[PDB]
Design a protein around this nucleic acid. Structure first.
Ligand SMILES: [Mg+2]
Ligand SMILES: [Zn+2]
Ligand SMILES: [Zn+2]
Lengths: 1215, 97, 64
DNA sequence: GGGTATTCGCCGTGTACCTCTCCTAGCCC
DNA sequence: GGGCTAATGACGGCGAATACCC
RNA sequence: AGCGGAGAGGUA
């Protein structure tokens, strides 16, 4: 019950090992693991509190209930150890022995395991070459097996026994399958099935034959007997693993496994009594079937019969699932030295520190307070120190303020999305019961102050403080891991004051005078002799970097921009801050301050900028009211004109001229036009509202209204939110997909009736439902994207290959999405166009911008020659840190957290527009009869060329399109050169790589077009070849088939229009168009949504997706097996260097899904942690694999250091 | 609320949960990924094994903090022992090689 | 934390070097000029390197 | 013979916190 | 009351199993 | 005296 001298037994276990091996369990191993058998089901004796002898909670089998005590009391001292009694033999050992050892059940009849039977790759059906229903009828006593293998009922059994004269024995149940698994010899069966695979050539028979050959090979390599599938001795759990929790009033709570164990023991005792008393055979078969169903319900409840109004858990339910042990007590465990609070914004603290309550600081750092009180000598024992702490003297607060001066803590919001959710701060002691936080930190946390909670964590080791200070402090996490923009952006309160401060008007007081420097401006502003904004001419001094070169010039600016020139560092020029401080302008200013200056000066500049914005926002005093929100004057006239127009349209529709659909379409068209006109009039009457005078003459300027400043300065809603508050909100939608015919002809300032409110509720609730479903799907996609790529770490400094990709700024036929400056920045080039194997900084991309370059060969991470990861020179430049990627930083988890983060936010004639020339690539023009130019091609590319050298847009040229001009012709804007007459599931569909609804059928190889063959239920499409035969296949007869007879098909064209499959485009050409298509589609989706994500985070994922490869010839390994690239390349180089000249064969790449790559890995621990634990455990049970222990999850599960980050030299010195 | 030393369970040697009965806050599954994205194996091993799960490290770290010395002992947690003793009760041999 | 980025190229090597330095100041070592800030100042002052840490570790192992 | 065409079954569905009650039960003296 | 005594209001994706026209 | 599982409600 209570032990005292056992607490100081330190250094009792080492647990030094290398690998984890799992295999089947022999019955002798189960008989040697246990310490006794059980025969009477009784877990708690009644009318007395003693454990039952030979029961579920026993003492002679497992151990004593009390520490160093026995049941009766003959030996009740610690001096007697290892001495058992005679009436109740309990080993007088520690209380820890009740968890290690276990017991066993002697079964009179055998019973088969359900994990090797009810699983979909059924191993017994592959071993005995039978189906699942036949062995289901045999194992549950409904058929017979003679001993060649066939289903046989009772009438065939009696008619065979009447003619065999007791010479044809046939068993039924577990004994027949036990004899069938025992009497087989797998060594001759391997050669027999090898002759069978040498004879039979059917494809599904080939797949079944290679599966059976691989299973037999794994069984003979592991050494496991085939009879170990069925079992005779069934072990039980230790009694300390499950508790018998009492309730109020002397009761006991129910359990799940104890009732199943008591049922198993009761059925086993009944079967043993019926076998001893020589029962008739039908009740013995019924008892054996009942015992089989009871054991099958104990092993996996809910798979066969769901034996109960709530089905209780079993041994397979409390491991696999949501409440399993892998996701509750292995990956994330509850830790101590923690606690939540309520966040509160505090402006009087720096960004490297945070607030902390005093009682929380006393309760968290209590052992440090005890150590300081022991060192100072004010308290002798820890009890007196604890009583002095709880008595709350004044020296306790002095000790608490002294003990944490530069000791960092950890802060973490409980809903976290990206890697910046855990930061470190140096806490200070404040009053209250709320944690004070810096306002610039909450942009990264995405934490609103409407009662949000975050849990703190206290690093207490000697190395954890250095790990939290050197790489987790808030002054080091400046840039986001997604893109190069810094996360220190001024929020809704700072940028409003900075926009009010850094603008100008027409005529204010104190203008026209010349100032000396910034100090004269600060001396003349505070006594209110000049205005906050006036057109003045000041003189400023700024140094020049090449190196420091001071310089004094003159400039004309405002008073607020001159007052802003005192807090910026000397490396920034004044031309980057003379513009009005908007959101993107100050983001560019923060990026330019971080780029070529440093870190600490940018940190203190962001510190002073928030204080300046606060001190000017408390002086501005902006307020929005009912007078500032204005309505347009012509709004009622435009509304009455539109009302007369829709009344005329309704009269013409009801008179019997136009149908209802076209009338509804023209009504919503003219109402959308009216809404656009109302929005334009509202923007014109809001932006150009204010007027002023300059020397008597009136002049127009930008208005200084409350709504217009918050609209133009950013950190608020868009122009649609201003349209909904000034003019009409347009047409609302319906949940089924249609648009309501009646509009909402009133803003939020005017009153609203019940009809438009009920119409707006439909659009209001659907957004909430979409955000909830998007949050759930974003969490699921984040978990899958983390678990698919977690082994890619930076191992080496160079690989050696120079394959690379072709980076080109993609265009679609309009404005550019990303330029070449945004795509090649932060990468490593492959070959020279600028030398090779160099890093492209912000200056090199500007030097190569004016060189008129089009495509640069860039080494990407999808083609590397490293082992168990990628190297540093191939990954490129890091996005979080501005320097080069260090050796040991994992990039898979960062890419997964970057991809899975914005998921909760996500839901005839071609006229040119640029001025320049036109280029012709991948096209062919034929001579027209009228002398014009007409292009003939399967897929053309009509691209243009600007004056700088980059393509502005690119169109497509269909079959027979007439182009108005030729190549090199000058085409201006607005000209017509073409003449021819006719979501988050989408993101998950590329990662899981499923088949589409109407998949596009692609060509087989580079062959000429042939004529269509005869049909026999499906269309046949033949292709003419040069030397080989014709490659023909089937075609769907439902959709349209467009194959040209007298034409020529290029190398891998298409014949059916639609979205193509990734497996077909992988089988066709290779991995580079697949990678380009995947990155292009994901980037177009994320640019249609509005969040920018760098390409290398997608390239790492699609490199991890293409891991398993197949071979077309068996040199040393099997034929249909799929192994990784690294092991196949190592064994190929080994067979080519040691065995012979060219021993192995060539490998072909194949594509798998994210779940298919997360399940079929080399190890078994990380693959059995998120999905399908039973199938992975069943596969690893019959294989006998050995875990190499190399990953970023299995080291967390085992408990050692991860091989990424600080714990790299430990793994370097271990091997 | 806050706590340093609290009660432990019987199945796994872990602290409880909730403001009542002195339950520590649960370290989430995504928080371990956010820690491993920074690297920092020393603050991930100390916040998973010697803080909560170990039956000897939870006393040894407290003794080293109160006394003054700095020498930690790394070992396997009790939850992995409970998991392997649960797997061994399913007629599947699993030994720490 | 900003000055130590120029003396070494690897951040994890800096963390392991400061961890090897922190195991000596706890047992009692006279400083150069909280042990974390003092060790970071001794690193950033270009005084403590990988050879001197090995020298003090060998002296501690010989004087144990 | 044979090569897919439905068809049945297995797999899964975010994180963290706060509060409350109710559990094994039943049956002839 | 008492003391031991034993439902039908989920939905999508993927792999094996007959099976039916050819 | 510490330790359990279900049902409902609420904040982010
Ligand atoms: Mg909030
Ligand atoms: Zn005894
Ligand atoms: Zn490489």
């Amino acid at each position: 019950m209570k032990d005292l001298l056992n607490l100081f037994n330190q250094q009792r276990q080492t647990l030094d090992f290398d690998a984890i091996k799992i295999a089947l369990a022999s019955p002798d191993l189960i008989r040697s693991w246990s310490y006794g058998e059980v025969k009477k089901p009784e877990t708690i004796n009644y009318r007395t509190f003693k454990p039952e002898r030979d029961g579920l909670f026993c003492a002679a089998i497992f151990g004593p209930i009390k520490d160093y005590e026995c049941l009766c009391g003959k030996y009740k001292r610690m001096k007697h150890r290892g001495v058992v009694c005679e009436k109740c033999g309990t080993e007088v050992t520690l209380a820890k022995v009740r968890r290690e050892r276990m017991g066993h059940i002697d079964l009179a009849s055998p019973v088969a395991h359900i994990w090797f039977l009810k699983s979909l790759p059924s191993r017994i059906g592959l071993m005995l070459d039978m189906t699942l229903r036949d062995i289901e009828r045999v194992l549950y006593f409904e058929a017979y097996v003679v001993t060649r293998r066939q289903l046989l009922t009772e009438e065939q059994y009696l008619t065979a026994r009447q003619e065999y004269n007791d010479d044809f024995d046939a068993a039924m149940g577990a004994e027949a399958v036990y004899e069938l698994l025992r009497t087989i010899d797998l060594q001759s069966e391997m050669t027999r099935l090898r002759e069978e695979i040498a004879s039979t050539g059917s494809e599904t028979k080939l797949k079944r034959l290679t599966k059976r050959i691989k299973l037999i090979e794994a069984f003979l390599e592991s050494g496991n007997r085939p009879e170990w599938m069925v079992m005779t001795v069934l072990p039980v759990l230790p009694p300390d693993l499950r508790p018998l929790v009492p309730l109020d009033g002397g009761r006991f709570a129910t359990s799940d496994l104890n009732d199943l164990y008591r049922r198993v023991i009761n059925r086993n005792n009944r079967l043993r009594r019926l076998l001893e008393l020589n029962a008739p055979d039908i009740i013995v078969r019924n008892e054996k079937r009942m015992l089989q169903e009871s054991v099958d319900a104990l092993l996996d409840n809910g798979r066969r019969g769901r034996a109960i109004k709530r089905p209780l858990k079993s041994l397979a339910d409390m491991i696999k699932g949501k409440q399993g042990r892998f996701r509750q007590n292995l990956l994330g465990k509850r830790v101590d030295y923690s606690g939540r609070s309520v966040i509160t914004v505090g402006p009087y603290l720096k960004l490297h520190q945070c607030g902390l309550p005093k009682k929380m600081a006393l309760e968290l750092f209590k052992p440090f307070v005890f150590a300081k009180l022991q060192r100072r000598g004010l308290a002798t024992t820890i009890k007196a120190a604890k009583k002095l702490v709880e008595r709350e003297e004044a020296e306790v607060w002095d000790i608490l303020e002294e003990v944490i001066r530069e000791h960092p803590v950890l802060l973490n919001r409980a809903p976290t999305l990206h890697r910046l959710g855990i930061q470190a701060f140096e806490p200070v002691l404040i009053e209250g019961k709320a944690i004070q936080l810096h306002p610039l930190v909450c942009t990264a946390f995405n934490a609103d102050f409407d009662g949000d909670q975050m849990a703190v964590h206290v690093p207490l080791s000697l190395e954890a403080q250095l790990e939290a200070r050197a790489l987790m402090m808030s002054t080091n996490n400046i840039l986001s891991p997604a893109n190069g923009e810094p996360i220190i952006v001024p929020s809704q309160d700072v940028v409003l004051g900075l926009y009010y401060m850094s603008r100008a008007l027409e005529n204010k007081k104190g203008e026209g005078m010349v100032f000396a420097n910034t100090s004269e401006v600060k001396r003349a502003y505070d006594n209110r002799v000049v205005e906050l904004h006036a057109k003045v001419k000041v003189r400023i001094t700024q140094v020049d970097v090449d190196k420091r070169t001071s310089g004094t010039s003159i400039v004309d600016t405002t008073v607020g921009r001159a007052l802003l020139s005192e807090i910026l560092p000397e490396g920034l020029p004044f031309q980057l801050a003379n513009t009005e401080m908007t959101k993107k302008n100050i983001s560019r200013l923060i990026n330019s301050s971080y780029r070529l200056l440093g870190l600490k000066d940018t940190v203190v500049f962001a510190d002073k900028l928030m204080y300046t914005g606060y001190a000017y926002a408390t002086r501005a005093g902006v307020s929005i009211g009912i007078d500032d929100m204005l309505i347009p004057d012509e709004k009622k006239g435009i509304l009455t004109e539109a009302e007369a127009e829709v009344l005329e349209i309704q009269e013409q529709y009801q008179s019997g001229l136009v149908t209802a659909g076209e009338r509804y379409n023209k009504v919503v068209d003219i109402w959308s036009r009216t809404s656009e006109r109302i929005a334009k009039a509202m923007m014109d009457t809001i932006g150009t509202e204010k007027v002023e005078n300059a020397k008597g003459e009136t002049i127009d300027q930008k208005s200084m209204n409350s709504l217009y400043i918050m609209a133009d300065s950013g950190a608020r809603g868009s122009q649609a939110q201003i349209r909904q508050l000034a003019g009409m909100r347009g047409l609302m939608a319906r949940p089924d997909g249609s648009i309501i015919e009646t509009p909402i002809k009133a803003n939020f300032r005017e009153g609203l009736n019940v009809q438009e409110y009920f119409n707006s509720t439909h659009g209001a609730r659907k957004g909430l439902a979409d955000t909830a479903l998007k949050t759930a799907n974003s969490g699921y996609l984040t978990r899958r994207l983390v678990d698919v790529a977690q082994d890619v770490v930076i191992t080496e400094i160079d690989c050696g290959t120079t394959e690379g990709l072709i980076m080109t700024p993609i265009v679609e036929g309009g404005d550019v999405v990303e330029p070449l400056k945004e795509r090649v920045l932060g990468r490593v080039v492959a070959e020279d166009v600028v030398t090779r194997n160099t890093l492209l900084d912000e200056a090199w991309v500007a030097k190569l911008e004016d060189a008129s370059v089009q495509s640069v060969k860039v080494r990407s991470t999808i083609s590397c020659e490293s082992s168990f990861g990628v190297c540093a020179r191939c990954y490129g430049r890091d996005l979080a840190r501005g320097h080069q990627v260090n050796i040991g930083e994992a990039v898979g988890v960062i890419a997964a957290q970057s991809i899975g983060e914005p998921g909760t936010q996500l839901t005839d004639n071609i006229t040119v527009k640029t001025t320049g020339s036109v280029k012709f690539n991948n096209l062919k023009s034929v001579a027209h009869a009228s002398g014009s130019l007409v292009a003939v091609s399967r897929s053309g590319e009509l691209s243009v060329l600007d004056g700088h050298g980059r393509e502005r847009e690119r169109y497509k040229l269909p079959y027979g399109a007439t182009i108005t001009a030729k190549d090199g012709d000058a085409v201006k804007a607005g000209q017509s050169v073409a003449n021819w007459d006719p979501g988050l599931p989408r993101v998950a569909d590329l990662f899981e790589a499923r088949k589409p609804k109407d998949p596009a059928i692609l060509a087989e190889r580079s062959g000429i077009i042939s004529f269509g063959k005869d049909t026999k239920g499906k269309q046949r499409l033949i292709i003419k070849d040069t030397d080989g035969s014709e490659h023909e296949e089937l075609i769907p007869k439902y959709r349209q088939i467009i194959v040209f007879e007298g034409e020529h098909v290029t190398k891998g064209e298409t014949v059916v229009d639609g979205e193509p499959s990734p497996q077909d485009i992988l089988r066709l050409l290779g991995v580079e168009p697949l990678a380009a298509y995947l990155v292009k589609e994901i980037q177009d989706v994320y640019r249609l949504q509005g969040v920018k994500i760098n390409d290398k985070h997608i390239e790492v994922i699609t490199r991890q997706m293409l891991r398993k490869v197949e071979i077309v010839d068996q040199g040393n390994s099997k034929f249909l097996n799929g192994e990784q690239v690294e092991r196949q390349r190592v064994i190929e180089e080994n067979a080519r260097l040691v065995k012979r000249n060219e021993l192995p064969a060539k490998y072909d790449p194949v594509l798998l899904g994210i779940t298919k790559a997360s399940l079929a890995t080399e190890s078994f621990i990380s693959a059995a942690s998120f999905q399908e634990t039973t199938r992975v455990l069943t596969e690893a049970a019959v294989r006998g694999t050995r875990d190499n222990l190399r990953g970023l999850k299995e080291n967390v599960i085992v408990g050692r250091l991860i091989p990424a980050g600080t714990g790299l030299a430990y793994h370097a010195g271990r091997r | 609320h806050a706590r340093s030393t609290g009660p432990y369970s019987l199945v796994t040697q872990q602290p409880l949960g909730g403001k009542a009965q002195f339950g520590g806050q649960r370290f989430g599954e995504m928080e371990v990924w956010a820690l491993e994205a920074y690297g920092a194996a020393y603050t991930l091993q100390e916040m998973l094994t010697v803080k909560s799960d170990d039956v000897q490290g939870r006393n040894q770290m407290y003794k080293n903090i109160v006394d003054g010395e700095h020498e930690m002992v790394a070992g396997m947690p009790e939850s992995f022992n409970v998991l392997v003793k649960e797997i061994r009760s399913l007629a599947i041999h699993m030994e720490l090689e | 934390v900003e000055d130590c980025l120029e003396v070494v190229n690897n951040r994890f090597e800096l963390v392991m070097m400061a961890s090897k330095r922190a195991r000596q100041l706890a047992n009692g070592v006279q400083p150069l000029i909280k042990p974390t800030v003092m060790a970071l100042r001794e690193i950033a002052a270009r005084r403590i390197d990988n050879a001197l840490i090995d020298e003090v570790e060998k002296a501690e192992r010989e004087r144990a």
